[PDB]
From a paper:
When assembling tau (258–391) at 700 rpm, we observed protofilaments with partial similarity to the GGT fold. The structures were nearly identical at residues 288–322, with an all-atom r.m.s.d. of 1.5 Å, (filament type 38a). It is possible that the absence of a non-proteinaceous co-factor, which was hypothesised to be present inside the GGT fold, precluded formation of bona fide GGT filaments. Addition of heparan sulphate or phosphoglycerate to the assembly buffer did not result in formation of the GGT fold (filament types 39–41). Further experiments are needed to identify the co-factor of GGT. With the exception of the reconstruction for filament type 47a, which showed backbone oxygen atoms indicative of a right-handed filament, all reconstructions of filaments with previously unobserved protofilament folds with resolutions beyond 2.9 Å (i.e. filament types 12a, 27a 38a, 40a, 44a, 45a, and 47a) showed backbone oxygen densities indicative of left-handed filaments. Filament type 39a is the same fold as filament type 40a, which at 2.3 Å resolution was shown to be left-handed.
Abundant filamentous inclusions of tau are characteristic of more than 20 neurodegenerative diseases that are collectively termed tauopathies. Six tau isoforms that range from 352 to 441 amino acids in length are expressed in adult human brain from a single gene by alternative mRNA splicing. Tau filaments consist of a structured core made mostly of the repeat domain, with less structured N- and C-terminal regions forming the fuzzy coat. Here, we report in vitro assembly conditions with recombinant tau that replicate the structures of filaments from both Alzheimer’s disease (AD) and chronic traumatic encephalopathy (CTE), as determined by cryo-EM.
Residue numbers in the entry:
A (entry chain A), B (entry chain B), C (entry chain C): 275 to 328
Write the structure that this text describes.
Amino acid sequence: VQIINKKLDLSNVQSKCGSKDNIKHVPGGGSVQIVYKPVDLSKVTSKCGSLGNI
Amino acid sequence: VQIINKKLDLSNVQSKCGSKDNIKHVPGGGSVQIVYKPVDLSKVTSKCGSLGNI
Amino acid sequence: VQIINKKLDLSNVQSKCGSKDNIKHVPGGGSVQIVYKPVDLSKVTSKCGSLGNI
């Protein structure tokens, strides 16, 4: 009758960033959301010799 | 009767960014969402020797 | 009577970005969504020697 997970995670990420969504998840009736002139200018640089497992 | 997951994750990502969606998931009746002149100018550079497993 | 998943993930991605969808999932009746002059000018550079498994 069990639920069994047994999860093993050895995954690798060098550089990780979340989302940059503008307007997101609005249940609010009659509400107003404005995002005015948003800009993403970010620089991400990742340099690696070996990235992995085993 | 079991539910058995047994997940093994050795996955690799060098650079990871989330989504950049403008307007997303609006259940709100009569609501207003404006994203006005959104811009993505971002730069992603990824350099690797070996990326992998085994 | 079981459910069994048994997933093994060895996947590799060098550079990963999510979606950039403009308007997405609107159950809200009578609502207004405007994305006005959206722009993507972003740059992705990926360089690898060896990418794989085994």
